[PDB]
Design an enzyme around this catalytic site. Structure first.
Site, PDB file in Angstrom:
ATOM      1  CB  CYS B  26     -21.834  17.153 -20.456  1.00 25.31           C
ATOM      2  SG  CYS B  26     -22.785  17.818 -18.929  1.00 25.31           S
ATOM      3  CB  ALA B  37     -35.927  13.659 -17.855  1.00 29.21           C
ATOM      4  CG  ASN B  57     -32.080  10.438 -12.690  1.00 28.85           C
ATOM      5  OD1 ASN B  57     -31.643   9.665 -13.734  1.00 28.85           O
ATOM      6  ND2 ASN B  57     -31.238  10.527 -11.930  1.00 28.85           N
ATOM      7  CG  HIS B 141     -25.134  16.089 -11.382  1.00 28.53           C
ATOM      8  ND1 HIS B 141     -23.742  15.872 -11.624  1.00 28.53           N
ATOM      9  CD2 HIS B 141     -25.505  14.674 -10.899  1.00 28.53           C
ATOM     10  CE1 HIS B 141     -23.517  14.584 -11.641  1.00 28.53           C
ATOM     11  NE2 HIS B 141     -24.422  13.855 -11.283  1.00 28.53           N
TER      12      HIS B 141
HETATM   13  P1  LIG Z   1     -24.328  12.275 -10.733  1.00 23.49           P
HETATM   14  O1  LIG Z   1     -23.319  11.481 -11.599  1.00 23.49           O
HETATM   15  O2  LIG Z   1     -24.449  11.981  -9.441  1.00 23.49           O
HETATM   16  O3  LIG Z   1     -25.677  11.698 -11.245  1.00 23.49           O
HETATM   17  C1  LIG Z   1     -26.129  11.731 -12.793  1.00 23.49           C
HETATM   18  C2  LIG Z   1     -27.696  11.412 -12.747  1.00 23.49           C
HETATM   19  O4  LIG Z   1     -28.160  12.142 -13.975  1.00 23.49           O
HETATM   20  C3  LIG Z   1     -29.095  11.120 -14.692  1.00 23.49           C
HETATM   21  N1  LIG Z   1     -28.893  11.648 -16.064  1.00 23.49           N
HETATM   22  C4  LIG Z   1     -28.016  11.335 -16.901  1.00 23.49           C
HETATM   23  N2  LIG Z   1     -28.185  12.044 -18.192  1.00 23.49           N
HETATM   24  C5  LIG Z   1     -29.418  12.702 -18.013  1.00 23.49           C
HETATM   25  C6  LIG Z   1     -30.341  13.682 -18.908  1.00 23.49           C
HETATM   26  N3  LIG Z   1     -29.831  13.537 -20.183  1.00 23.49           N
HETATM   27  N4  LIG Z   1     -31.294  14.114 -18.313  1.00 23.49           N
HETATM   28  C7  LIG Z   1     -31.734  13.729 -17.162  1.00 23.49           C
HETATM   29  N5  LIG Z   1     -30.921  13.088 -16.283  1.00 23.49           N
HETATM   30  C8  LIG Z   1     -29.979  12.664 -16.545  1.00 23.49           C
HETATM   31  C9  LIG Z   1     -28.261   9.999 -14.505  1.00 23.49           C
HETATM   32  O5  LIG Z   1     -29.290   9.037 -14.553  1.00 23.49           O
HETATM   33  C10 LIG Z   1     -27.728   9.871 -13.003  1.00 23.49           C
HETATM   34  O6  LIG Z   1     -28.695   9.457 -12.012  1.00 23.49           O
HETATM   35 ZN   LIG Z   2     -22.522  20.015 -19.003  1.00 24.29          ZN
END
Ligand SMILES: *P(=O)(O)OC[C@H]1O[C@@H](n2cnc3c(N)ncnc32)[C@H](O)[C@@H]1O
Ligand SMILES: [Zn+2]
Ligand SMILES: *P(=O)(O)OC[C@H]1O[C@@H](n2cnc3c(N)ncnc32)[C@H](O)[C@@H]1O
Ligand SMILES: [Zn+2]
Ligand SMILES: [Zn+2]
Ligand SMILES: [Zn+2]
Lengths: 311, 305
Positions: B26, B37, B57, B141
């Site tokens: 992933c 980001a 985020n 995370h």
């Molecule tokens: P968990 O499932 O609690 O939260 C995941 C958060 O990560 C943010 N997100 C998804 N994909 C990315 C990337 N590529 N870079 C930075 N942040 C990411 C989602 O917005 C969820 O808030």
């Molecule tokens: Zn991963």
């Protein structure tokens, strides 16, 4: 762009963080509530029509009550005294509340009122929560149409918060904020006695409030005319929700006065009905903070819901 | 058993108790960073071989770009992601106590960065594990959301703990050993089933010293906490068949006053996801909890790993 909004009725900030029209649901032939099977239910409180074997609705004790009516004399900890009842909304198993005709919905509303008036005879009760669950994921355990009533020995948090925020607003402006609903929230539909809106600082996406147009502190002061009028508007909101959001589960909740409301609280206390379609859940942010994140502004919900056609 | 209403100064609300049987590659993967980001820092600091990263985020709930702008206020805030492991299939609770400690020290680092901004009033550190607990990604995370306002649970906690201190001269979490039902204990922390728990099998991890701010944590307490968090998460997984879960750090407002300090005491809340809500909870803000914390502590004390 995101925004935080607050309203006196919730007395809290919500975060708005966004297409609105792309929001949709992501979710036996008999049962003891079915006509003829009454001996399989907990004790009856009353039916409509009264003592007619051919009943349209019944109000009964909950077979698995959250609170115990037998703890009344007993009253960190208080005893779990209360009342927990079930309103069976149809003799027929497969009909959903929104399929009932406005007069039939009016009769349910009037039954809530009759039952409230019965409970209000107990000094130990301080608040009664009338609510409905449709859909397993919205907390329904029974497929047959019904709603519930929980009478409590305490005034709960939402009611305390509402009293506090509406009081502050009244002291600030001289006004009841729900009497001002048409200028403060986003109007959707209007009936003879009620108006529906997307709340300015709505907690949940596509949340709708149905609000008496007259200043009314108590739900159970509803009369028969208002009941059928409210029934029609409730029906409408539920059917528009069912079309626009692909028949999501939902909950509705009546927000009313505490039973020992004071004269001084009356000018800013105004009951309303809150409908919340189930579209999304929460995680650690909302649990941790008590602040929700709403992905759809009420401006946009109102636009969408006003354009819904049922033909 | 018989239903009962219970209240705690920390929640400052009644809950209705109404009853061992309870149960459930992933872009974050090492080698995929440009796909995220902007990075804020990593641990080890500037090390290509990272053990954790703290990033912005990609889809933030609040906008860091609205700072100058600040019944409506602009949606300014910080929304960050803490990536807890370079390894995709590792769950937080599988990590060793020291590594969990590192993650806790990283929360601390990031809080102190955020606290340099006068416009921020509260910071919520939280974890989601499992889709139904609000996770959208399976890589381990957690997240941080920095807010321009003090949110309702914090205001409620300040009110309730103030009231209690005014009536008893005590901080209620300092008395956790006599007020709540103790499960486990580390050198600096104690874990309990809270007396007036909102949710079935809720567990709080409470600092034994009166500590108002999470981010005053040091390296020793971080590893100590890490080990106790790990123990509670692993006991939960085993007793309740690996349910989804959330955890939430409850800490002081950034502009907390001197007069609030004697009754302000941070803690970490763990909520296994076991049940959902209906119109009663939505309407009243009162929860119904099917398992008394007495029974939870008893069950949880007996869990063998
Ligand atoms: P968990 O499932 O609690 O939260 C995941 C958060 O990560 C943010 N997100 C998804 N994909 C990315 C990337 N590529 N870079 C930075 N942040 C990411 C989602 O917005 C969820 O808030
Ligand atoms: Zn991963
Ligand atoms: P909805 O799914 O919101 O709530 C259903 C309530 O009905 C109660 N209940 C189940 N079965 C019975 C019988 N036979 N008689 C009376 N009440 C009943 C459940 O306890 C739910 O609260
Ligand atoms: Zn039926
Ligand atoms: Zn009014
Ligand atoms: Zn303390």
């Amino acid at each position: 762009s995101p925004e935080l909004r607050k309203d006196p009725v919730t007395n809290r900030w919500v975060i708005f963080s966004p297409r609105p029209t792309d929001f949709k649901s992501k979710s036996p032939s008999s049962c003891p509530f079915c006509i003829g099977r009454e001996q399989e239910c907990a004790p009856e409180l009353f039916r409509v029509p009264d003592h007619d074997p051919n009943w349209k609705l019944r109000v009964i004790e909950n077979l698995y009550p959250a609170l115990s009516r037998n703890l009344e004399t007993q009253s960190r900890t208080i005893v779990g005294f209360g009342f927990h009842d079930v309103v069976i909304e149809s003799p027929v198993h497969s009909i959903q509340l929104s399929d009932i005709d406005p007069v039939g919905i009016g009769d349910i509303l009037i039954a809530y009122k009759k039952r409230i008036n019965q409970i209000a005879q107990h000094d130990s009760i301080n608040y009664i929560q009338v609510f409905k669950n449709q859909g397993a994921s919205a907390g329904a355990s029974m497929s047959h149409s019904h709603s519930q009533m929980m009478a409590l020995p305490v005034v709960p948090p939402t009611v305390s918060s509402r009293l506090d925020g509406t009081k502050d607003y009244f002291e600030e402006t001289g006004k009841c904020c729900l009497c001002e609903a048409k200028s403060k929230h986003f109007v959707i539909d209007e009936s003879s006695h009620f108006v529906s809106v997307a709340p300015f600082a709505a907690t949940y996406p596509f949340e709708i409030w149905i609000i008496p147009k007259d200043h009314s502190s108590h739900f159970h002061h509803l009369d028969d005319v208002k009941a059928v009028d409210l029934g029609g508007l409730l029906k409408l909101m539920l059917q528009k929700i069912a079309k626009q959001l692909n028949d999501p589960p939902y909950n509705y909740m009546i927000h009313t006065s505490p039973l020992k409301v004071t004269e001084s609280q009356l000018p800013y206390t105004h009951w309303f009905l809150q409908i919340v379609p189930q579209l999304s859940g929460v995680g650690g942010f909302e649990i941790g903070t008590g602040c929700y994140i709403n992905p759809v502004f009420p401006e946009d919900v109102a636009k969408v819901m006003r354009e819904v056609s049922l033909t």
